[PDB]
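Hello again,

I reread your note about wanting to compare the complex against the isolated chains. To keep things tidy I'm splitting this into two emails, and this first one only covers the full assembly. Below are the input lines as submitted, including protein chains and any nucleic acid or small-molecule components. They are followed by the predicted structure of everything together. The single-chain runs will come separately.
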Amino acid sequence: DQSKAWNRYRLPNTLKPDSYRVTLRPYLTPNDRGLYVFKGSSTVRFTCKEATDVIIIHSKKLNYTLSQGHRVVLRGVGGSQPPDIDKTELVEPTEYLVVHLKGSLVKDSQYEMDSEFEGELADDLAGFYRSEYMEGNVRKVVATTQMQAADARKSFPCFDEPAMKAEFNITLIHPKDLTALSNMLPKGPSTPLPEDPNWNVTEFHTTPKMSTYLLAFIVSEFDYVEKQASNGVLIRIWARPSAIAAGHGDYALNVTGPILNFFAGHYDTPYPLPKSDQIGLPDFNAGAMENWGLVTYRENSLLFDPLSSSSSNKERVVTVIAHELAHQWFGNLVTIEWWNDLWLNEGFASYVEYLGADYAEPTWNLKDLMVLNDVYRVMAVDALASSHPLSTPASEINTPAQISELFDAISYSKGASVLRMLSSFLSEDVFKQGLASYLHTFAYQNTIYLNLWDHLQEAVNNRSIQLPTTVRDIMNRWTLQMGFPVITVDTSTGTLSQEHFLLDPDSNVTRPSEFNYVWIVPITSIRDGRQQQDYWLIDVRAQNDLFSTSGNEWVLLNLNVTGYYRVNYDEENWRKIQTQLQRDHSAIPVINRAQIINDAFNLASAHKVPVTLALNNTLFLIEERQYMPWEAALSSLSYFKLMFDRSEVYGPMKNYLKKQVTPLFIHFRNNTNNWREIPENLMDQYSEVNAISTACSNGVPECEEMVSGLFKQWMENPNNNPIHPNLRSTVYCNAIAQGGEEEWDFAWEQFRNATLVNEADKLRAALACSKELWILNRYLSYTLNPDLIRKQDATSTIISITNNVIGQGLVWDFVQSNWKKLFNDSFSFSNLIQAVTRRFSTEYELQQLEQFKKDNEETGFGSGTRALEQALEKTKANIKWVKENKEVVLQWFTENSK
Amino acid sequence: HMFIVLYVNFELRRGPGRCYNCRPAVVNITLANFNETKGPLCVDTSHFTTQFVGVKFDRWSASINTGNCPFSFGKVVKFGSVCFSLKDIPGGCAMPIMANLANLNSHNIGTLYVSWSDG
Ligand SMILES: *[C@@H]1O[C@H](CO)[C@@H](O[C@@H]2O[C@H](CO)[C@@H](O)[C@H](O)[C@H]2NC(C)=O)[C@H](O)[C@H]1NC(C)=O
Ligand SMILES: *[C@@H]1O[C@H](CO)[C@@H](O[C@@H]2O[C@H](CO)[C@@H](O)[C@H](O)[C@H]2NC(C)=O)[C@H](O)[C@H]1NC(C)=O
Ligand SMILES: *[C@@H]1O[C@H](CO)[C@@H](O)[C@H](O)[C@H]1NC(C)=O
Ligand SMILES: *[C@@H]1O[C@H](CO)[C@@H](O)[C@H](O)[C@H]1NC(C)=O
Ligand SMILES: *[C@@H]1O[C@H](CO)[C@@H](O)[C@H](O)[C@H]1NC(C)=O
Ligand SMILES: *[C@@H]1O[C@H](CO)[C@@H](O)[C@H](O)[C@H]1NC(C)=O
Ligand SMILES: *[C@@H]1O[C@H](CO)[C@@H](O)[C@H](O)[C@H]1NC(C)=O
Ligand SMILES: *[C@@H]1O[C@H](CO)[C@@H](O)[C@H](O)[C@H]1NC(C)=O
Ligand SMILES: *[C@@H]1O[C@H](CO)[C@@H](O)[C@H](O)[C@H]1NC(C)=O
Ligand SMILES: [Zn+2]
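Full-complex prediction:
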């Protein structure tokens, strides 16, 4: 098996492509077998780097027309003479088309390979696929693409690895009444197809040297709005004609150009293409895709209605655009060598997205949200023995399932957090200078992590920055080994101690680390609200008077959580923190109030502080009005809800949250004139939503009356929605849970007739809050019907059902019952496993999960393999955590609830 | 009595792939009873009434601005004799004619020129 190259997952080094030409023709009507198909041809010019008698190229779900007895024709280039083909074959597991030759190709000679093929325009959201939408009574069909990571092979045969960069000459044959789009501008006007005038032919300029996973082909009846950016680049926002006319693409137009030129100037690197199209698709798997010159989006990540979309929707739009535009530099111009280093793409994009979004909306202060949405989001998983390093060894990443698995919170959020810290010990101006050199040197090339350290070292040296050692040796600690440390402070002594933080002390770390899980940590600090000097921890244990205290003094580490680590303190320092939070919490920075809450709850799970200490840190929240500290508490306590919302402990917890949030809810009731205004400050808008959501969810009668009143008022006037978009997610879900069949049906019809995906998303999620088990079962059957819920929203909707305490048993039973059938057929098996198992806290549930593993082990879990192992680790920890904390927690809530 | 009527119509380029916020592809600006080769349409009245007939579909609308004119089309007021034209009247005012996309682009699609004497 493995002896043969066509049974191995990495391409041989024998051939290297130079240039492709591809012609594709989508058929937007089904054939007599009921299939939407595309017909195509292609020629790849490649160079023989090493003599070989076989051509191995990627091919997936493509049916080839035979020419002269074989699936390809091989021709010579500039005198070259190609050997005869013995036979061709398709190797499905490795997704190869293999051409066995009778002779050997000659080193350094060039060859050209012609192929003619057919494929399905399936609704699977991968490769060359189809998207549909209603315009009037007509169902329109769109041909569009999604190649990342390894689906370019699904639209035409190619050497489909990111380091086999090449130029591409795209031609699209399309109905005459439709527009064709690709990475580049068309090479002349669209001409009629001589064979049939009902079709036109659009040829596009040759792309730059590029990875196959960045190609894009789109055929649509879409319209657009355009604006030339201040750096010469033409921006166009494409979407369904009704959305464009209504102005739902106007906000994207307002911010796209400026962000693109901001990035160009910030990194001193021009955007080399003449245009950058943004297009929103009705059917799309991820949030967006950074195809060079033709960025594709989910409608809910690009389109925005000022009167019906919420501020959180607005943040999503500008953030994703910023994320996709950042990829133009980190990903498209400079590309990863192999998927094991994916963070070089997604880590930078997830960090740089905040700089670009902050430039576009400077009044929002979005950069602060990185602590909640990235740092603490990924620390939950990075605190497991089953996590994985930011830069995995390349030998370990081979299959498409292994590759897809790494589009996860490590590569995205941890990558963002190590860059946030990297860009903090060095200045952002020193950081951006090093990256400018990195981008210039490796333009149109591929990089590994060591390539970046070198150019950051060049900046360190030119700017006279003094570090404890090289950028290489500091950042390898955060890149080549998994996890993060917990820095324990003893203020009586001033000693610091670091160690690998694990949510469960009994977890078994099996992955070895060449650094034995010790980091070089840049430590900031404040003393009584006053920043001290920076300090570098370079060993397991150190001592410095910067962390010693006297009398009423208290210190905090990790100012504004710039560093990727958790902090624990001696008992006495904690007490003075808590005393400070009770007397005047403003003395502690807002971000560090969230740190105090989140760190203590996680420390308590790890048996490093008493759970009552973490809960005592939430007592001051009854006087807190800011968004970040409340959201940190609500997120940490969502674990308590997961563990206890099916037990006697939930009552007392709800009463505690009711007590803590009621003054804040009444404050906003006043500040908004009984909910007819919204706060001016964005963060205050989000705290209002959480106050309403928390009050209603924990039984504040005033909020329950308010949300059901607003919803009933809406049903009496369906065409005039009285609910501000910021409150719709909460009002819809709580009105559905409190109501019955009438409210569920009304929202279902509103979802079916929705003209704005932002609105459909809120309705889709609120329909899962029903308290009627029969309604939830019926809704579950809808999620797998593509005519009722788009396949792109299937798993997301199922996850909404499992979050309902009544839906938990329904979905888990459904997953156990239908996994084999499910697995075949766009569908995140990883996220669903994560969602349906996070409530598990008993030996019985662990037994079922173990049996679930055994019953499906041989078929496999694909890109959900790590998710399952992490579910097992967390379930075992949950069992121990509940036995050890149930009575303590029950008593704490009961006493502090009065 | 006499009416002074300025008609302003415009159309967007037909799909597919139409640019919704671009300058309208078709523009028809007509000042009633005006012949370019004869010159300004001047007032022959004891009293006259100005009428603006601008197109309006969805978020697109036509408008006439005040420009560098001490008055505005519609609110005109004593007169010696007032003249209107769609070509330059040296010594007069210029009222820009715009095609406006609500909350987005505005496009100048023409110019009304006015002239008057005191009296
Ligand atoms: C893709 O298009 C480019 C541009 O038309 C082709 O590049 C030219 O290739 C010919 C060889 O046939 C050279 O003589 C020209 O000098 C090249 N021009 C440039 C600007 O490089 C390329 O060959 C095409 N590739 C394929 C596979 O068709
Ligand atoms: C810690 O983060 C806060 C933001 O959460 C920073 O505060 C801002 O500082 C700027 C400039 O000093 C002010 O214009 C803003 O009004 C501040 N915002 C708030 C909410 O106070 C603070 O500067 C950060 N600390 C450090 C040392 O960088
Ligand atoms: C390609 O061939 C396979 C096997 O013959 C068939 O099942 C599939 O439907 C074909 N694809 C198309 C688009 O016709
Ligand atoms: C298709 O070709 C015809 C004839 O050249 C042309 O009039 C029409 O604009 C073309 N359509 C597109 C979408 O380019
Ligand atoms: C885009 O910007 C224009 C110009 O500032 C502004 O008038 C418009 O309201 C903005 N549109 C949206 C949807 O933000
Ligand atoms: C560092 O300085 C050298 C010499 O001036 C220069 O060639 C190099 O580009 C600089 N590197 C950075 C990152 O500025
Ligand atoms: C929790 O608060 C109580 C006072 O109600 C206090 O005695 C106790 O020390 C706190 N828990 C800690 C500090 O872990
Ligand atoms: C232009 O508008 C005038 C006034 O509405 C109308 O009479 C005329 O027919 C129009 N001309 C064209 C070519 O549409
Ligand atoms: C406009 O006036 C010129 C000059 O008198 C004349 O030749 C032309 O026929 C007129 N056109 C119309 C439509 O009255
Ligand atoms: Zn990305």
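For quick reference: The radius of gyration of chain B is 16 Å.

B.
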